[PDB]
Ligand binder design. Structure first.
Ligand SMILES: O=C(CO)[C@@H](O)[C@H](O)[C@@H](O)CO
Ligand SMILES: O=C(CO)[C@H](O)[C@H](O)[C@@H](O)CO
Ligand SMILES: OC[C@@]1(O)OC[C@H](O)[C@@H](O)[C@H]1O
Ligand SMILES: [Mg+2]
Ligand SMILES: [Mn+2]
Ligand SMILES: [Mn+2]
Lengths: 286, 286
């Protein structure tokens, strides 16, 4: 395992829908202004990122970076098409290379399949293909001091693992020291039998956390049982990244936002949302 | 507005993935056995149902019927393709005709758009086309003593209305006395600011209710705040259909199950699930 600490982050889409020079600065300035320790960069196309520009911004604002992504149909490592798995392998290596160049240590999110709606259930072969790709990625990342964190997401976003317990079985199949479970309270609110079971089962295997409200808006305005969740994190003495994640039609990443079906305005003022989110989380954990 | 009564129902997919002669008898006998007042028949293809045989089964088991459906891409009444809207109008007329023939009075579900994951947000034209379609359907249904109930569903299943408050603004534009809001606790768990706000706002305009757990399995084994939801129903003295809705990979409807991304086995025993659900609901309402 590469070093993890208790640190608080904001997902780029709280502030910015692109990673242009302007968009990168808007997101990094926004995270720093609210007092976050790190920005989580959305790396859906890691060839698009200006690495030198981004490193200069992280140094300018004294901010750390982690990275998350989802694969697409063209890069789906669950595919029975060996050429598509190979394109997925290539994108994940590029994402790892970008994160390394930014001095980051965490590549998280839906790195194990195409993010979005599958037309049917996953086969044993789809799952086996994903596990092998995550072994190859974990080994590549390990050479660069990077941990990979497999995000459990809801049924509309993957057919591979929708609960923490399914995620832990997948993780154990990957069987690599720098691979961890990533839990997201928004996804857990749909799929889990309460908000404690998966955290208590994970213990030291839990390597990354996303804090999202039931509707992905302001924390404490939805249905998520944060009290039970933070009680469980305390029980396992979780000391890893905690990212505030929120999506509003106010700020659109043309790819990610439509894949995540962000039809509604849940907020308009990024600074107010992000400030209140960090206060909400620190009141309950730290 | 045609008469509504407080009555408890089971969705057909609790028992049968198809509405064959055999599937219909299994589902109707199952709903009767569990002590439900009605079965909710899924009419995604209303030409597929043997109406006379179903009528005989309803009489045989002393059961009532209501109907729900979702449209598909080919029948999407939000489409800017007038030929697709016409196919949707035709499907909804046929569904109304089947419901009338079964002596039912409620056509509910995702009747105002294609059920499933839109690749992008709805245009003003998409919303206008949906409103107009629901006016034409309401007027057709009114001639056969049928109410229509527009089911608010989550972002992954419609881009038109994801909260009760959005549904009520939509119904204001429809402006038909036999058009009602339909709320579903599974969808509310994702999209709503708590489980009361939309119910209190709807009052008499709430015409239909689905009871679904957060993961669509056994009631009480997920995250839905049923205490808050049933309290709100009591506060408006809701007197209309309440249908238990649940999906497991155990019982598959080739189309609907994959649209709803039902990847997991949440149950195997239809009678245990349906009996426990009815007891769960009656202990908390009526
Ligand atoms: O909640 C849902 C879909 O998620 C159901 O109630 C469907 O709308 C209905 O059409 C199934 O028959
Ligand atoms: O919860 C998520 C998706 O629903 C993930 O955090 C998201 O896909 C990230 O990969 C965005 O960078
Ligand atoms: O890998 C796919 C999988 O996790 O999909 C969900 C199922 O519940 C589980 O048994 C697996 O088939
Ligand atoms: Mg007869
Ligand atoms: Mn997340
Ligand atoms: Mn429903």
């Amino acid at each position: 395992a590469f070093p993890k600490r208790l640190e608080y982050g904001g997902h780029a889409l709280v502030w910015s829908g692109d990673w242009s020079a302007a968009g990168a600065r808007k997101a990094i300035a926004g995270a720093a202004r609210a007092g976050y320790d790190y920005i989580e960069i959305a790396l859906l196309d890691p060839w698009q990122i200006d690495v030198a520009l981004t490193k200069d911004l992280l140094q300018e604002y004294n901010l750390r970076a982690h990275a998350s992504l989802g694969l697409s149909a063209a890069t789906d490592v669950t595919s029975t098409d060996p050429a598509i798995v190979a394109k997925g392998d290539e994108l994940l290596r590029k994402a790892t290379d970008v994160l390394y160049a930014l001095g980051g240590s965490e590549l998280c999110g839906v790195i194990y399949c195409a993010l979005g709606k599958y037309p049917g259930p996953a086969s044993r072969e789809n799952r086996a293909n994903s596990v092998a790709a995550m072994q190859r990625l974990a080994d590549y990342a390990a050479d660069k001091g990077i941990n990979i964190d497999l995000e459990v997401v809801n049924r509309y976003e993957t057919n591979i693992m929708n609960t923490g317990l399914e995620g832990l079985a997948f993780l154990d199949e990957v069987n690599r020291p720098n691979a961890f479970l990533h839990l997201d309270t928004y996804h857990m609110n749909i799929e889990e039998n309460g908000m404690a079971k998966s955290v208590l089962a994970a213990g030291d295997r839990l390597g990354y956390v996303h804090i999202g409200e039931s509707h992905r808006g302001y924390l404490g305005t939805g249905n998520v049982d944060f009290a039970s969740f933070f009680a469980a994190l305390k029980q396992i003495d979780y000391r890893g990244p905690i990212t505030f994640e929120s999506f509003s039609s106010e700020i659109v990443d043309p790819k990610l936002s439509n894949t995540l079906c962000v039809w509604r305005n849940l907020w308009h003022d990024s600074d107010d949302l992000a400030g209140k989110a960090l206060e909400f989380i620190k009141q309950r954990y730290g």
